[PDB]
Structure formats: C-alpha cells, structure tokens
C-alpha cells in the first residue's frame, strides 16, 4: 500500500563524505527561497527517531537561517485523500496516498509555517508540477532553491533537476533531507553534485 | 568541457538481468509513442564501438515495430550552438554543447526519422521540457510512452518521470537505452521500474 519500505536508522552524511561539486554557483540570500519539501507527519512516521530527530533539528536550524536572512520560505504538502483521477499513476506505486486530516497532512511542528511562507500544494514528485512556484520564484526575482524535506532520491531530487532545468541554482543540503536508505541518500547527493545542483551542509550554509 | 566521461564497454542488459517491476502496466500500440531520445551523432560518438551497435541494432528492431504497429514515432534532438541564453545552467555541468552542424546535430543513419514522425526540439533533460510533446500525445489521445535513446540516467529517466508525471505510462526499454556505465544503467533501471517505468527489453515488447 504506501510504496515506502522499512527505514533503517542511519547518519546523516558530514561535509568530508560528500561529493565533490562540479558547478561552482554561491548561495546568494536575496536571490533564494527554502523549499520544504513534504515535511509533514506522514512522510516522516516511516523515519527511524533518530533519523527523523536529526533531519528536523536540521531543517529547523537552516529555516531559522533563512528567516533571518531574508531568504523566502515555501513549503510543499500534498492534499491527502487525493481522489483516483487526482492520484492517477502514483497509486501503483504509492497507494491511495495520505488521508487529508492533520494526523498525516500537517507540517511537522518544528517546522511550523509562518504567515508570509508559501504554501504549494503538491501532486506529483517535483515541487513545481502543477503548482505556482515557478511562477512565484520569477514574480519575486528570485532565481536559487535551497532543498530540504523528504525524500531524497525522489521528490526531493526531480524538484531538483525541474528547478535547475529552469535555470534557478539549486542548493540541496545534504543533512537536512532524509531518505529510504543511506545508499539512497548518497546516490541522490552523487547525482545532485555532478547533474543539477551544489550539495552542502546545514553548517556550511549558515557558514 | 562536455561534461561526458570516458565510457568503458559494458553488455547490454538482459531479461534475466532486469530489476522486476512493481507496475502493471501493458503496452498497447494503439495508445503508444515511441520516444527516440537523443539519438544523435554527437552523444553516440563517446560510446564505444559495441555499445553503439547493441543500442542502435535494438533501437532500430523496436522502431521498425513501432511503425508496423501504428505506435507514432518521436525524435528528440538539440538545435546546437545553443546561446549562452538558451544554454543556460547546462554551461555549468556539460559545456556549450553540440554545434548545429550535421556532424553534431543529426540523428544517427540506422534510426533515420520518416515524415510522419514528430521532431522536438530538446532543450533541457526532459523531453517534455519547453517543447510540444505533452500537447501532442494529449491530440493524438496517446497515453504510453516507449522510451529509448541515451543517456539513460540522465534524459531518458527524467524524461520517463516527466511522463509519468502527467499519468501516461512510460515503458523504459532497457537494452535500447545506453550510459556512462554499466552501474548508471542499471541505477536507471531500478530507479524506473520502482518509480515511474515498466522496464522491458526490446524482445519483450517484439513479443
Ligand atoms: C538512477 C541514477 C543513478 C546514478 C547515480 C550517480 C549519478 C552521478 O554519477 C557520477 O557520474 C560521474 C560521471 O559523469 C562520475 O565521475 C561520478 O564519480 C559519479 O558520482
Ligand atoms: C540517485 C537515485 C539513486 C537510487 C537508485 C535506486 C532507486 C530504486 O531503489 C529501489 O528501492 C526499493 C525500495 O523503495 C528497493 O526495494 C529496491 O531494491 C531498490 O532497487
């Protein structure tokens, strides 16, 4: 039924054990939004403690960067209870999906959205599928994407490559996504650095 | 400057050798467009001698069923001598590109397209990508997409995502296809037929 297989507690990865990057772009805050990609309750349940404990601990820590540094925030977050037309082909690996009540839909508290975040609904694995953040991202003259969320090889990577394939300089941070797996998570950062985006660490963009 | 590497021989992927699939899908030809990705002169020069042959051998036995089918046949292929504009963040990771010339831009002689075949213009990984693919399959009420061409973990899987994306069933043919490696095949393998693919082998959709 969810297409999400048993989570094996693993590190996040550390600055020494991440892939050289082979772009060379420098976060700028004025040109940047946070994408929060599909940190709510049900995405994150399959995480072991630990792992859900670092990874939230992370992102929190990098939202409160991009506040105060006027990066603007978005956030993704699926519908829930999706209907079979709406759902289309994420059913046959995914199941019927979430329900819509705030026991799985929810952004997670340490993470609760603020009054001038945006807020995309999501459909599909990229963050820009159906949505208005391309639109949103020109209208604000904004052209990076910092990537945080779940999950890295999937969602979290193709909104990646859609973002870069728009010419936006995307910023994935390595320790502030989780995945199914560390091998998942690893072959995501291995792509990120050589195909669409520089791969840094929580600590490394907060300097 | 290209941003592709030396590529090693390696054997095309078997039937035995396939990840299984977790979808159901079932090709049928009446619904069907057979996407020839990429199958230019310039991507195929880096590939060596029999990797080449296996992947055009298989390319041209799938096109030459397509069209006693009735599948529609599709070309992606770049204009070359893209601009700095049009290159955009593709500068960054593959250098300027291909130049408009046939010894670049052509499709390569064994897969020649006919006149009634589509040509796109590709701009970005996706085939989908600013150009009228979608459009096209929606009018020609076309919902399956037989994907072959290179490189497999690159264009090919983010164009296979894209179509999945939009519900249209996406059939990855996984000895059609050629890559970097040997191991980037097959990650597009079992990234595809996990997420977004039915992965078959060009016999397999010969029947
Ligand atoms: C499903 C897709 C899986 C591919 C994961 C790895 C993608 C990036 O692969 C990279 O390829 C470069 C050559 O281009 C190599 O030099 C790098 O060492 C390798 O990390
Ligand atoms: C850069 C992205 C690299 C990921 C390559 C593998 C993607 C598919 O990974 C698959 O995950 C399934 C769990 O969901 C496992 O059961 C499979 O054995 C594995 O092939």
Redesign the pocket.
């Known amino acids: 039924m969810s297409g999400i297989p048993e989570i094996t507690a693993y590190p996040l990865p550390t600055a020494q054990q991440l892939?050289a990057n082979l772009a060379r772009w420098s976060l700028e805050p004025r040109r940047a939004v946070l994408l929060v990609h599909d940190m709510q309750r049900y995405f994150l349940r399959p995480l072991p403690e630990s792992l859900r404990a670092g990874l939230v601990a992370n992102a929190a820590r990098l939202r409160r960067w991009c506040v105060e540094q006027g990066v603007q925030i978005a956030y993704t977050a699926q519908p829930g209870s999706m209907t079979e037309e709406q759902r289309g082909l994420l059913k046959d690996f995914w199941g019927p999906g979430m329900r819509a009540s705030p026991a799985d839909r929810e952004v997670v508290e340490e993470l609760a959205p603020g009054p001038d975040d945006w807020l995309l609904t999501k459909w599909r694995y990229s963050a820009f599928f159906h949505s208005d953040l391309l639109q949103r991202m020109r209208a604000a003259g904004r052209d990076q994407l910092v990537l945080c969320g779940v999950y890295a090889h999937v969602g979290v990577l193709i909104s990646t490559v859609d973002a870069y394939s728009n010419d936006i300089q995307p910023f994935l941070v390595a320790d502030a996504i989780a995945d199914f797996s560390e091998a998942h998570h690893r072959?995501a950062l291995?792509?990120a650095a050589?195909?669409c985006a520089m791969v840094v660490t929580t600590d490394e963009v907060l300097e």
């Open positions: 892939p072959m291995e792509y050589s195909r």
